[PDB]
Design a protein around this ligand. Structure first.
Ligand SMILES: COC(=O)CNC(=O)c1cc(C)on1
Ligand SMILES: COC(=O)CNC(=O)c1cc(C)on1
Length: 182
């Protein structure tokens, strides 16, 4: 409807795939080459389905900060025959707050879904499903089962992936440029 949704759509149409693990179907953001991200609770294994194609996982790493605290981001390298458009220049360098964010989801259950979530708070520490987690972003939307791995954008920036909610607020893990230096 407006430039927030325009940026979000441009990211979904070229930089997302549907990832299936034993723990369900997730929106998965492709970042550069064959490298993508998914929430660590997806429990990526040796094989994953990508748009319903059996795909070998070449490498997967559950990120933690230098306090050895969960970040809830897994970086996956896929044995795929095609590279993602490089979107690393849209990743923030620092932890920050944001206005006017969009959460975008693409699965069999929720195709072409875009949610204007509004203001995003650098919340930081949260107990997420019993797991102490850092760098959590918070927004006041009653997000639901099926939105995990959804992409959080502003106009011009890709700032996080949706990892949970409590029924009133939703929670995302930050994406930082430093995660994807090669
Ligand atoms: C909204 O209430 C909160 O708990 C937010 N916490 C902070 O202020 C905070 C945490 C980190 C890291 O940087 N600022
Ligand atoms: C503050 O309330 C919560 O932490 C709600 N829990 C989740 O969002 C959650 C995510 C996963 C996986 O398992 N539980």
């Amino acid at each position: 409807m407006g430039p927030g949704f325009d940026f979000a759509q441009a990211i979904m149409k070229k930089n997302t795939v549907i990832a299936r693990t034993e723990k369900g179907e997730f929106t998965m953001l492709g970042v550069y080459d064959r490298v993508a991200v998914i929430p660590t609770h997806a429990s990526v294994g040796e094989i994953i389905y990508i748009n319903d194609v059996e795909t070998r996982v070449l490498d997967a790493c559950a990120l933690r900060d230098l306090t050895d605290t969960n970040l809830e981001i897994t970086i996956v390298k896929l044995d795929r025959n095609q590279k993602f458009r490089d979107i690393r220049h849209f990743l923030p360098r620092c932890e920050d707050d944001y206005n006017d964010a969009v959460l975008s989801v693409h699965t069999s259950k929720f195709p072409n879904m875009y949610i204007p979530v509004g203001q995003v708070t650098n919340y930081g520490f949260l107990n997420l499903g019993g797991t102490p987690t850092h760098r959590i972003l918070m927004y006041n939307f009653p997000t639901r089962a099926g939105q995990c791995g959804g992409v959080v954008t502003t106009t011009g920036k890709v700032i996080g992936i949706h990892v949970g909610g409590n029924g009133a607020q939703g929670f995302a893990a930050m994406l930082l440029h430093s995660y994807f230096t090669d």
